[PDB]
Amino acid sequence: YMITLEVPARDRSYAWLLSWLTRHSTRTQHLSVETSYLQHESGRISTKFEFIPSPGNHFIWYQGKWIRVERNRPWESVTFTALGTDRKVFFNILEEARALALQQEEGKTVMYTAVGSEWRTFGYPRRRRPLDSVVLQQGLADRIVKDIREFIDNPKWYIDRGIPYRRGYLLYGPPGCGKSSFITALAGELEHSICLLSLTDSSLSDDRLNHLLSVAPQQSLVLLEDVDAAFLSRDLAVENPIKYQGLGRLTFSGLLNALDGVASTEARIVFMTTNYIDRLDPALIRPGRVDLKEYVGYCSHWQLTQMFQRFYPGQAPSLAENFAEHVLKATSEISPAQVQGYFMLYKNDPMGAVHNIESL
Amino acid sequence: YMITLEVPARDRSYAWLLSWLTRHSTRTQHLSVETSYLQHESGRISTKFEFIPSPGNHFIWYQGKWIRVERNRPWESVTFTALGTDRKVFFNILEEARALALQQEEGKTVMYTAVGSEWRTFGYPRRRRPLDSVVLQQGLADRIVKDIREFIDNPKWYIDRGIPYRRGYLLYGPPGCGKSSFITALAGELEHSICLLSLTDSSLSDDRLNHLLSVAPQQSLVLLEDVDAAFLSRDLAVENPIKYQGLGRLTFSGLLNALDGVASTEARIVFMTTNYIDRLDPALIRPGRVDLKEYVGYCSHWQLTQMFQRFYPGQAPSLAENFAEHVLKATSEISPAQVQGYFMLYKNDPMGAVHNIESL
Ligand SMILES: Nc1ncnc2c1ncn2[C@@H]1O[C@H](COP(=O)(O)OP(=O)(O)OP(=O)(O)O)[C@@H](O)[C@H]1O
Ligand SMILES: Nc1ncnc2c1ncn2[C@@H]1O[C@H](COP(=O)(O)OP(=O)(O)OP(=O)(O)O)[C@@H](O)[C@H]1O
Ligand SMILES: [Mg+2]
Ligand SMILES: [Mg+2]
């Protein structure tokens, strides 16, 4: 007579338990190697040999209980066998795992991915990009931030009238203007998590897409990159239905219903990005599916001035005006990425980038 | 000499027994983790650790009978082994499961889905949308409600003359007018259940479609979304037979016979939705397969007035007339979804949406 807690692979606290188990690797006869390397120079690579507990029956001595944990071997099922019937030690283990895991993810952003029909983490947590480091047009980031915050802070008003509690944003513009960078900065600012979804995958279907959109982690953003490339439309729409034009078992109607239909879930934010606004079917970007659409474009006077004052702090304000005037006189349109590269050429050299502005 | 009740996966009361078993999880040596999370803020996520009984041979103490329940492990078969030959405990268990399950589904709508050749539930029951929250044209929802109620309440008249006891409705219009929302509201009002069916699935055939249409749950609605996209027609029909145009092993004649043929079942309601009424073959929408067809269109004066008086309750009636007049003068055609979004911009701000009506 014992208690055999069974936690299979498909669990939210799976990573938390794995992290705690790696933390409590002491007193474990079976091990797995945990070496990592940091090269410095001269062929002297630092070693960091450690011990991940192997998928075995290691006996743990938590609170003097001789707890036995077994991880099997692609299907995985972790087991926490104990003595008697207490259930308190399980709660303590879960709480300690939560305390340890959330401590690790502090000041970072966790990136998930779509594996099969489920979300799994993708690498170590990434360092968040400061929001002010991304410079957009005057009064554009503030509007999006305010709209998202208002949507988050008013759930009652949605329920009191019956509208589904959902939202969606679309960003479009020329290549190299700040779409992905702004999305990353916003995710870092809002302390959310990014879920990456590809519509051209070879293992995605309508039912799997609906399940993925239904089981998305809480306090997270869903990102759809280049929705146009997954469905040719417009000129085709005048003659025949919208073909899928790719590899994967997906249909236009399935995606349309999944984004906003009858079985769509609640409390979800979806971001979409494209480079050809005119290649998107009108039914896809109608209100209800895309509440706010914004255009990010080429540089302007204020944007160039802010970029200059950001890359060379401490300089006099006249230099920024000189740089902006010269850039806008020498060329008409320019992308922020090109300006960033040109600045990267002249590292820590103010008044040097104000002279060699020949980039026609 | 015992009694071994066997209930495989393909049963209607399967969910009821699973819910009862989760209710009676006490005195079970083997367990499975039942933790859920509700984020609040500051990285403080509430834990709800519980215990779903694992697929094991847990010994239950219902009525002091030492009942043994075993769930195997994709094929599933639940077993209720008991002592002697009584069969009374089985009646009591089924009745308690029914009492518990129907208690949970109160005021909600259950959404089913097509898995293989059987209907299975899809997530938690969803909150029902009030019917008055969806505003359609004058005297349109009432007609459909009355027709459906008349069909439900008169089975004798159908039998006494020999007509098959079936019905079907079709809704068509511009994208973003209220088709799906009205269907959801009607399903909530009628205390029915929604079954989602996709005609472009990669595992659908004529025999499977017939089986699914024959085994649909009682007191339920069958929904076919975007029937046009599954069969190109019209201009093709003038030259060659109807092609399927997609992925899946289905034919036009198979669908036509399944909807209304010789083997079609009785007491079934089917809803169909499309955006291009002119792309549907005449044989598909003939009487007998689609009894009532209705058109949902753009906004009108009364619809706009009702929407305004719904989103801002307590306002004077003149404001609604002013808003309707200004909207209809500034623009001719406008979808209700755009009106909903424009109202969503001005939250709790009457007399503000009556001034900034520039949405051309
Ligand atoms: N507004 C901006 N301010 C600062 N850096 C920017 C800005 N826009 C782009 N960059 C820089 O350009 C590089 C890539 O930008 P990013 O990937 O966000 O562009 P994009 O417009 O989303 O491109 P693509 O459409 O090809 O995905 C990064 O080094 C990023 O810092
Ligand atoms: N008549 C209406 N009254 C109130 N809200 C409406 C109405 N029509 C649409 N909406 C709102 O529009 C949004 C989506 O509407 P819905 O999905 O029902 O439109 P649809 O015409 O069925 O669209 P699609 O053809 O793309 O499926 C929801 O927020 C819903 O509340
Ligand atoms: Mg990018
Ligand atoms: Mg709809």
Author numbering:
A (entry chain D), B (entry chain C): 47 to 119, 131 to 417
Extract from the study:
The human AAA-ATPase Bcs1L translocates the fully assembled Rieske iron-sulfur protein (ISP) precursor across the mitochondrial inner membrane, enabling respiratory Complex III assembly.
Further 3D classifications to look for different conformations yielded only two distinct conformations, with 3/4 classes (322,765 particles, approximately 95% of the selected particles after the 2D classification) resembling the ATPγS state with disordered TM cavity (ATP state-1), and a minor population (5%, 15,083 particles) resembling the Apo/ADP state. Global superposition of the refined mBcs1L-ATP heptamer model with the reported model of mBcs1L with bound ATPγS gave a rms deviation of 0.644 Å for 1,743 aligned CA atoms with the ATP-bound Bcs1L slightly expanded in diameter. In both C1 and C7 maps, the nucleotide-binding sites are exceptionally well-defined in the density, with local resolutions estimated at 3.5 and 3.0 Å, respectively, exceeding the global resolutions of the reconstructed maps and providing confidence in the assignment of nucleotide state. The conformation of β-Sheet II in ATP state-1 is partially extended with the density at the tip being less well-defined (top). In the ATP state-1 conformation, both Matrix-seal and IMS-seal are open transiently, allowing passage of ISP-ED.
